[PDB]
Amino acid sequence: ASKKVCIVGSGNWGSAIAKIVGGNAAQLAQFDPRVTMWVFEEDIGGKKLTEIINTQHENVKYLPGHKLPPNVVAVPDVVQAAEDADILIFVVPHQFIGKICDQLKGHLKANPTGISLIKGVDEGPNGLKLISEVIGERLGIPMSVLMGANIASEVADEKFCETTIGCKDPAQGQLLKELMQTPNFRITVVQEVDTVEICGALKNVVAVGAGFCDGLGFGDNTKAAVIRLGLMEMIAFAKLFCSGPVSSATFLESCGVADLITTCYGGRNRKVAEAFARTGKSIEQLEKELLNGQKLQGPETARELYSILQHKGLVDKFPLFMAVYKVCYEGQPVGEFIHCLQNHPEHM
Amino acid sequence: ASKKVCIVGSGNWGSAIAKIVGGNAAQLAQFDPRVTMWVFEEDIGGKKLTEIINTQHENVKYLPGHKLPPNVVAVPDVVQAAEDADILIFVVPHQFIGKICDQLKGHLKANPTGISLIKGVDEGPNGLKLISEVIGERLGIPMSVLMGANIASEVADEKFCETTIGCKDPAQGQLLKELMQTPNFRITVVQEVDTVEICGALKNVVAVGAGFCDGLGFGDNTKAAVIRLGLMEMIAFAKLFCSGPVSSATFLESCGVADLITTCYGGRNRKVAEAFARTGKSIEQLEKELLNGQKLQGPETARELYSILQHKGLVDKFPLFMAVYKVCYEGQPVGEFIHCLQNHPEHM
Ligand SMILES: NC(=O)c1ccc[n+]([C@@H]2O[C@H](COP(=O)([O-])OP(=O)(O)OC[C@H]3O[C@@H](n4cnc5c(N)ncnc54)[C@H](O)[C@@H]3O)[C@@H](O)[C@H]2O)c1
Ligand SMILES: NC(=O)c1ccc[n+]([C@@H]2O[C@H](COP(=O)([O-])OP(=O)(O)OC[C@H]3O[C@@H](n4cnc5c(N)ncnc54)[C@H](O)[C@@H]3O)[C@@H](O)[C@H]2O)c1
DSSP: OOOOEEOOOSSSSHHHHHHHHHHHHHHOSSSEEEEEEEOOOOEETTTEEEHHHHOOOOOTSSSSSOOOOTEEEEEOOOOHHTTSSSSEEEEEEEHHHHHHHHHHHTOOSSSSSEEEEEOOOOEEEEEOOOOHHHHHHHTOEEEEESSSSSHHHHHTTTTTTTEEEEEHHHHHHHHHHHHOBBTTTEEEESSOOOHHHHHHHHHHHHHHHHHHHHHHTOOOOHHHHHHHHHHHHHHHHHHHHHHSSOGGGGGIIIIIHHHHHHHHHOOOOHHHHHHHHHHHHOOOOOOOOOOOOOOOOHHHHHHHHHHHHHHTOOOOGOHHHHHHHHHHHTOOOOOGGHHHHHHHSSOO | OEEEEOOOOOOOHHHHHHHHHHHHHHHHHTEEEEEEEOOOOEEEEEEEEHHHHHOOOOOOOTTTTTOOOEEEEEESSSHHEEEESSSEOSSSSSSGHHHHHHTTOOOHHHHHSEEOOOOOEEEEETTTHHHHHHHHHHHTOEEEEEESSSOHHHHTTTTEEEEEEEEEOOOHHHHHHHHBBBBTTEEEEESOHHEEEHHHHHHHHHHHHHHHHHHTOOOOOHHHHHHHHHHHHHHHHHHHHHOOOOSGGGGSSIIIIHHHHHHHHHHHHHHHHHHHHHHHHHHHHHHHHTTOOOOHHHHHHHHHHHHHHHTTTGGGGGGHHHHHHHHHHHOOOOOOOHHHHTTTOOOO
């Protein structure tokens, strides 16, 4: 029997993914052509967004200049969207996944599996807690993740790129790959799930600082350095707080070095972080003023890093991460950022 | 006794290095204030360049909008400029190093040392042969290297960046760091010379490829993957052709990931690579029409990797490098570049 797929989420990335998943489900036999997409209902000029999506087959508010495959159906109730799904792609802003596992808990199919595209980290009474873990625990289903240099707008334009899928079960990995891959969306399945997922979360903090540096008037040599030092801390962080095995070779996958690069140069975090350096407005305000409803995962992830590090009394071990955190939330002048670069340890 | 320094070269990078070396030499006791710089004489409208430099204290033709420290003296005869030097900074386009060397052979001080900033590779009977090695053997002097994300224009504008110094001798490493370091030019000394030098050489080949993709109309996700797949081939190439230990860590130094990033975004090879993808003019002609005298090291380096690989019969082992080489010299359509990424192996 063909597998039913449900896309929980519908934003910039969620909509781009819909195009890829919609296209594959329709052309592939192993996947049910009917693909549901949970859409947090919104009123746009009196019309309901779900209505507009199923009528015009496009979510222009979040993914401009693109159509969505007709077979992707917008469903306002999450339970109804996931009810009969065999595979659930979790792709919503970090701050809402919690409540969504709410309603979903206990209303899923027997052997339903899931894959997460959410970038960020959670905290557990005992160390760091991956979003994928939290979701897999609450919903009780096998989890995988997809992480890579995939700025939505470029993906929706079908511009060549790659991504990394973290899945322990080979059979499932080859499965998710057949569902996600495209002649221009090349995937590499990997087993070190945790490392691949933390690369996605942590790279956004680095990108906020990169953004700060642009707002300070610096160029490529500097952004390269911020990227380079942040990578030093990312690997240091993963090897410290991640359960079991953590290899550096994993950071050389799309989820590490490549995602770090494309994000520091063209991600939403870089843009806002640059404006923050210039205007002095709040991360929140700029978020609302510049992203037309899309969510930043950068700042809040830094905030989470802070909490995770202090509960271990190790706040002084990650200068760059904490410098990003302090400028965003503590009021530290952006003009002192360079300083964390000038005194950053040579190795960690 | 202070050490006299001689800068062999006066180009884009040579001139910036002169500012940095000129400044520290004047400010630090261990270095003689008189800094000689060999300048390949040029007739700039009836005036000798060396005369312009020593009078106007600027080499605008190669480093626009900047002055050079008065203590940096332009010397037209390389033997005269290097004669009394204790430290020699080799920084000239790859194509001119060989001739300069046999001119210097037997004319250096007994215990003279040298550091090479030249990016490229040569070929010896059986395989690879590093430029620094060729210089050391021909001039019979100990060698070091300086390699990092260092776009000259930015280094000259005093914008924060880092660089890597590859030196086997600790004492000599610290000394070179004192002569080269700046509050905005941060140095890390490592002993893996060979790997550091191979990174500078190889990354330009990747940058030519990045420029191609820009010329094909692609964005950041594609450039990121280009850099990522390029790194994969770099490490695999270094581990296979370099003498002695080649650690993957070394690539996380400025000379590796960083320079890879900055070059692919604001380097001369990228600029020309793009113009080549658009106009169809020869690289040589573009080099002349766009860099007002400056020299690209990327295309010739690819031409060299081809020679090396074709002598080991491994031309088929490095798709990306050889794709860069083929588009540059065989007439392979540039549009066919993405094809070497789509079919690129996942691991090497
Ligand atoms: N934007 C990208 O290019 C990109 C690329 C790779 C991964 N991602 C990741 O994808 C995840 C999803 O982000 P995204 O880009 O699809 O969205 P957005 O950040 O593009 O959009 C905000 C979305 O949140 C929803 N929303 C707003 N208020 C809500 C509420 N109160 N409750 C529930 N939902 C609400 C809206 O329905 C809208 O779809 C993120 O974790 C991010 O890291 C994004
Ligand atoms: N440009 C950069 O930002 C940068 C940054 C790091 C490393 N580098 C490396 O530094 C090395 C030096 O490059 P550069 O940027 O100073 O030069 P250019 O490429 O900036 O200049 C060409 C130079 O070559 C000289 N020249 C021309 N014809 C010659 C001849 N026939 N004989 C001898 N010399 C001749 C000129 O005097 C001129 O100074 C290169 O190998 C490069 O990879 C450059």
